[PDB]
Amino acid sequence: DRVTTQTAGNTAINTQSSLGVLCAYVEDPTKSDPPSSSTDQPTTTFTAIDRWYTGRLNSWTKAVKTFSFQAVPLPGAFLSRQGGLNGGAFTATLHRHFLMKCGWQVQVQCNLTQFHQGALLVAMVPETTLDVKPDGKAKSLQELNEEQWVEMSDDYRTGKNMPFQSLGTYYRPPNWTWGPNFINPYQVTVFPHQILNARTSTSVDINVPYIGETPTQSSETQNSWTLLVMVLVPLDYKEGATTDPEITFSVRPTSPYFNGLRNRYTT
Amino acid sequence: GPIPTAPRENSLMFLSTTPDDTVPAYGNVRTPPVNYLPGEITDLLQLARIPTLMAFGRVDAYVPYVAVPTQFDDKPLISFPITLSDPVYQNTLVGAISSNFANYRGCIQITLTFCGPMMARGKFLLSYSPPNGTQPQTLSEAMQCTYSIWDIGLNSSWTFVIPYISPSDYRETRAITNSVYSADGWFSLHKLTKITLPPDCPQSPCILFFASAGEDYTLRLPVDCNPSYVF
Amino acid sequence: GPIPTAPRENSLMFLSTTPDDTVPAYGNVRTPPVNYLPGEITDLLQLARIPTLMAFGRVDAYVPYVAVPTQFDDKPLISFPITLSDPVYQNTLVGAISSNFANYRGCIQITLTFCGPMMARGKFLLSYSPPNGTQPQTLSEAMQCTYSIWDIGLNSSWTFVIPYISPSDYRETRAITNSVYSADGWFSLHKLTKITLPPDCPQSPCILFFASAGEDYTLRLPVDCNPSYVF
Amino acid sequence: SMACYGGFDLYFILDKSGSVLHHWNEIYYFVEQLAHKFISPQLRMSFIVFSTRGTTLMKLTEDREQIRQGLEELQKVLPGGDTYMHEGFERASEQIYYENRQGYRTASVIIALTDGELHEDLFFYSEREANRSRDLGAIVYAVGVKDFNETQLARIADSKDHVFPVNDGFQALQGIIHSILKKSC
Amino acid sequence: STDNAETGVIEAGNTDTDFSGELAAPGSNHTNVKFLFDRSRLLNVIKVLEKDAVFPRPFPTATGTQQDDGYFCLLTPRPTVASRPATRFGLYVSPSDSGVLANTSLDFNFYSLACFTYFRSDLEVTVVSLEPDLEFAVGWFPSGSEYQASSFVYDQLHVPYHFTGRTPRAFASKGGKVSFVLPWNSVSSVLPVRWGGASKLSSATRGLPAHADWGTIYAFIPRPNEKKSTAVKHVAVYIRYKNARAWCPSMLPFRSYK
Amino acid sequence: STDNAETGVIEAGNTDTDFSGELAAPGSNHTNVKFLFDRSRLLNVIKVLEKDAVFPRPFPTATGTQQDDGYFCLLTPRPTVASRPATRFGLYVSPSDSGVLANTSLDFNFYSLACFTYFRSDLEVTVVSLEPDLEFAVGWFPSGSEYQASSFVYDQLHVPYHFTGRTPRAFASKGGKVSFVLPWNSVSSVLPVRWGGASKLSSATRGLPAHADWGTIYAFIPRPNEKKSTAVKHVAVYIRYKNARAWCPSMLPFRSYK
Amino acid sequence: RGNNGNMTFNYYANTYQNSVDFSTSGILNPLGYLK
Amino acid sequence: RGNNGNMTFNYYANTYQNSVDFSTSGILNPLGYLK
Numbered sequence A: 001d002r003v004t005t006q007t008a009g010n011t012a013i014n015t016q017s018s019l020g021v022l023c024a025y026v027e028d029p030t031k032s033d034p035p036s037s038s039t040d041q042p043t044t045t046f047t048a049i050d051r052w053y054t055g056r057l058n059s060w061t062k063a064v065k066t067f068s069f070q071a072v073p074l075p076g077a078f079l080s081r082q083g084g085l086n087g088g089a090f091t092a093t094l095h096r097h098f099l100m101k102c103g104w105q106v107q108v109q110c111n112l113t114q115f116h117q118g119a120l121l122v123a124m125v126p127e128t129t130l131d132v133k134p135d136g137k138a139k140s141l142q143e144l145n146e147e148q149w150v151e152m153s154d155d156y157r158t159g160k161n162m163p164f165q166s167l168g169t170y171y172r173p174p175n176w177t178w179g180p181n182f183i184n185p186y187q188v189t190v191f192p193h194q195i196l197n198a199r200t201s202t203s204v205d206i207n208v209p210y211i212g213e214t215p216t217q218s219s220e221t222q223n224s225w226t227l228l229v230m231v232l233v234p235l236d237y238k239e240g241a242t243t244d245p246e247i248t249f250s251v252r253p254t255s256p257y258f259n260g261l262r263n264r265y266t267t
Numbered sequence B, C: 001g002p003i004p005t006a007p008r009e010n011s012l013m014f015l016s017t018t019p020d021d022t023v024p025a026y027g028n029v030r031t032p033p034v035n036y037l038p039g040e041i042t043d044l045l046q047l048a049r050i051p052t053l054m055a056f057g058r059v060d061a062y063v064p065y066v067a068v069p070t071q072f073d074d075k076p077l078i079s080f081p082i083t084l085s086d087p088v089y090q091n092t093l094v095g096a097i098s099s100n101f102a103n104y105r106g107c108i109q110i111t112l113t114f115c116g117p118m119m120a121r122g123k124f125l126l127s128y129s130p131p132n133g134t135q136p137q138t139l140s141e142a143m144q145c146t147y148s149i150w151d152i153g154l155n156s157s158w159t160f161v162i163p164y165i166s167p168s169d170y171r172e173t174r175a176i177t178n179s180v181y182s183a184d185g186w187f188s189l190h191k192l193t194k195i196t197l198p199p200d201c202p203q204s205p206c207i208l209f210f211a212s213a214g215e216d217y218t219l220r221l222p223v224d225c226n227p228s229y230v231f
Numbered sequence D: 001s002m003a004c005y006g007g008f009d010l011y012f013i014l015d016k017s018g019s020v021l022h023h024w025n026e027i028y029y030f031v032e033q034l035a036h037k038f039i040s041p042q043l044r045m046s047f048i049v050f051s052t053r054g055t056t057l058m059k060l061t062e063d064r065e066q067i068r069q070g071l072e073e074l075q076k077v078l079p080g081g082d083t084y085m086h087e088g089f090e091r092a093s094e095q096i097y098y099e100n101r102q103g104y105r106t107a108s109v110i111i112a113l114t115d116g117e118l119h120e121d122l123f124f125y126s127e128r129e130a131n132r133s134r135d136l137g138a139i140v141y142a143v144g145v146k147d148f149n150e151t152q153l154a155r156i157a158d159s160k161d162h163v164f165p166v167n168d169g170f171q172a173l174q175g176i177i178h179s180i181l182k183k184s185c
Numbered sequence E, F: 001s002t003d004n005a006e007t008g009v010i011e012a013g014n015t016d017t018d019f020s021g022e023l024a025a026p027g028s029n030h031t032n033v034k035f036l037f038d039r040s041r042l043l044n045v046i047k048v049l050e051k052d053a054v055f056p057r058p059f060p061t062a063t064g065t066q067q068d069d070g071y072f073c074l075l076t077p078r079p080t081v082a083s084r085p086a087t088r089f090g091l092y093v094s095p096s097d098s099g100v101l102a103n104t105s106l107d108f109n110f111y112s113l114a115c116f117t118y119f120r121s122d123l124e125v126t127v128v129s130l131e132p133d134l135e136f137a138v139g140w141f142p143s144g145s146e147y148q149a150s151s152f153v154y155d156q157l158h159v160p161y162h163f164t165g166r167t168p169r170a171f172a173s174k175g176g177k178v179s180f181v182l183p184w185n186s187v188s189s190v191l192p193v194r195w196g197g198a199s200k201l202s203s204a205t206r207g208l209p210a211h212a213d214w215g216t217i218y219a220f221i222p223r224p225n226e227k228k229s230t231a232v233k234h235v236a237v238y239i240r241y242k243n244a245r246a247w248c249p250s251m252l253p254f255r256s257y258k
Numbered sequence G, H: 001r002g003n004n005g006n007m008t009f010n011y012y013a014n015t016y017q018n019s020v021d022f023s024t025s026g027i028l029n030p031l032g033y034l035k
């Protein structure tokens, strides 16, 4: 029934309100051939990275409005340790390989009692720059603590605040009004998603394959998927219930292919 | 020798959508293969069928759900005309693919979800009226139309499939025209019995609305899109 | 009678590389036969595979070899980026055929030759680093990359075949672009153990470098060449 | 000048960037406190905003119903966007040059506000437009909301003497704006 | 019917599921991706070269650089600026005459239906003149090549180096047009409509693909540089996506409510 | 791997020879000789004749010879001077007005890839005008013939003898071009890109082939000599090497390091 | 087949007209599979 | 075959189009054979 234990390596996770594993775009997103843009032998999966990586995520209060998202880039959260999410021996291999080609398998846990209401929209959103400030630089761990939840403003709906290049003193700087890495917040359900309602489930299960513009992408500079927890209905409860339920997530890379070995990445 | 031809009146005309090829310039280019990419959109009706959120003006900060008050009133809790130019359909994938076309045909599928607490029990009447001279507001005026009663329980979604009742085989997807009480009629969510909540549960739960396309929703005649998303 | 045609928008256009013939003018000319000439180039990749000399700035008088000093230092004896626009590749047949193209694909083959005396014994480490943020200089930073140790003995040549490690299937043959620490990385010749010469032998022998193409080096997309050889 | 000014104006060139999103409730309090203090009909004031489009939110007017209608609009302005402070100055430069063609020796005063300081490609034009507005005959004051380089506003204002923090700003501009009112006609 | 939308998959029903009804007949296949992008539309109005150009130097371009702007058309549906690919699209609202107004472009008909992430297609380029009786020529260079910017003196006439080359320079007849289909020549396997990675280039910026383009065309007039005219002549570049494939569904742009 | 480069033959290895690797798939055949020279490129900008010419007399030409220079285009990738084949290529750096500036030519796109010694091909000649609305004509005479230089009076109009002949005089329509493919007509079996022998001719000079050419074209205007215009009109000669064969590998030119 | 009414006759070959991929060695399926 | 996409139809004959040699009576081979 609704009791699915997903054993992987030396780390298994249970759930007793499982809606089902939302496999994305294919029947089995684990099946994946090697990259065709390498003339060396890839470092395939091995039993020390074939496991789940639980890391926390900011609490979900009543102060959060509608559509306030919270983006967790993959593999970009392994590398900056976003939400206490130490990558283990996966990040110890991701820093030492130039190209990496994996498909993810995430699971977001948030335990609501039957007297709470609310609905997170968890989705694996491909190719977005939501972790990056409208000023280029990526967000550090302090800036993820200084806001706790990114409000869906007009700059995110229009894509006005995606990072740009400085045109220099020569060109008159144009009035930027649009950029293609917007979020249309009403159409995030086109992505591989499940809704974490406060009355059906406590754990959503998304399983996505590797997508990307090249048959394998760079290891440091890829953001081909982005976990995206969006509030559709705000949390509401009466005074006495468990305030601020925590949100966690659990990321497992299915069938990686590491190509291009070198020493540990020094900027 | 010379084949005696006779070129037509449309000689040396550049027509933008000529169903035909043209001369290559820089051919014999083997492109790198895309056998690795999953999820190919063969047809853009694979995305109208994916249900996306609607946008209702609260009682540019709009809300995808309907807050359900505890006060009795014999008018629909939310009501919106079934027209894919209506602003509760601008940011669905149904109403934003179809606004880039000229005709449509088939069944809009309005999916609901009761995002309240698990301990809530209630019922909702869901009436689609065809175009009448007056929008039906009373529950007894909407009991007579195409309705269906949705009981809140364990499973928390209901997919009211709006029928395609129209004389013409393909309805116009954009009713920006000299307007009346708009065909194709009105959807309306009536609360039948009030939502009975146990003590220490939040008042006013939320019915999250979706809007997908049916298994027979078909589009026709591309038109030039509105470029006003960029200003 | 007349076949009714419809000439296109590119009528009476002279395109320089149209993959097609044209009208003869002065035909039926039997040419004298060239059955006697040997060595026909069927393909210009029969000449990238022939190893030609490189050119290193000495410690327009450049030198095809690397003079090997007797002084210990933990930096590479010579190091040059694997980019076929780099000026240690202008006058090879690999880098001067490929600079007249736009893409390449495959394995550059760097052949060495120890042109010192026969009584010299030594070893050389030969590291190809992929593009890192910093060029590796220490022997321990270049031991970790793709290396191979070359022992000087009876046979006096070593063909270090540089792998084709790149995301894109065809690398750009000309990196004249807003530049960084250049892909595709760096070749580097480290002396591992010092060259031990018997008495009355010349100090500082010479490692003559070559640069050929592999058995899978393939070129694509001709471009207009730089005519600056003539000024 | 020893000759008194026939007119006297005031320009609230206000930032509505993404950086002032947590500080617009403090910038709006600063503007209303200077509008509802100077109620003289000699002084006209105009409300210019900028994030990406430099937009004149209220023209150079003096009708205190219109200015109240102007201040009821500034309370409901959503911050967000880049910081094009040069296009804040171009809307004032279209109004100084339009009011230098009346025969009235007026006096243009410009008040600037910024949290998020400008990139090099944007500071080059805002320093250029502030040089343009002084050549049109303005007095540029640069009021600073929270942490800001004075040097990045030293070029924009007249000098380092004309750059003020926002907590000291109404304390500064109480008599600084009032000093030219007695100087005027 | 009774369903669970938290599951993430809602099966597309019909009228017969809840009620008494019937299936409507399938109308047409005009939503086919290979059918719907295979039609021409305007991309960018570019000026026509009249001498040997200077290609726009990469950003941040400083003042004083004598270069030629608004002549090269980076053939891409993604937003460009100054003939180089960009992320944001910027239009000048009140373009005052301080600084060089950078020629931006975008494919307005594409993004309103670009409900996908990756998109690969051939490209038919038709270059319609916007000048009465203009005899122009349409040079081109692929994704990953650069412009050959000098002149060689033939017969005391500075004929530039963009008359010849190994890339197609189609010459137009007077009063005519230029139309030719370009193959997929970029090094990436597909073109990212939306890209989230970082291009390790001249200083790295998130969300900016490096080789998401079909090339760059430019229009020149086939006369040497001594026969230079005075007035500025424009040309308009239409574009058709032959044999389009699209992957990985995504969002459509936010239509506002004001 | 262990090898001997003194042997003179080094076998072209792969990654799998020394390391663990694999063969990359073969990309394309654009290095094929028959593919790579079979594309058009500019050869020489020549003036257009307006009367019966005087062909350039052979070297050393003394002063006072009233001849017509810069009208004949000796169709050869090798360097020419004054419509006759030469060895060295000379361009005037500061051309002061003492003496007649000799029209030199060279095929810049050929020698940068002429990594061979002998080269035989047919020749497609396209003669593009460099003048608005020019009705010209492209005469020709093979390798080893001479120009017929006089005029015959038809109807009190000095019609020259280069209007007729047994060799192709293609007439262009107004605003049009002339394109025709010439066969290999030289008496040598191949054309020497590099030649080391001596031509036993008018005084013998090493390194100068006598019949390494496809002929000589010249442009004239189809009017008699009484209808002579005043201004000088140019025409540009493009050339394509159809069905190219090449023998005996050799060097590519020295790219400098300054 | 696309927006192509030329069912009869292709003059140029398939490699010159289109751009085929090189080798590495109706029914609208869903884009998400609940398993 | 060269830079020739006309796989279908040659109008002119082979002697008129090309220039064949008169009679006297893939695998890239190396240009130097060590023996």
Ligand SMILES: [Mg+2]
Residues within 6 Å of the ligand: D017, D018, D019, D020, D082, D083, D115, D116, D117
């Ligand atoms: Mg700011």
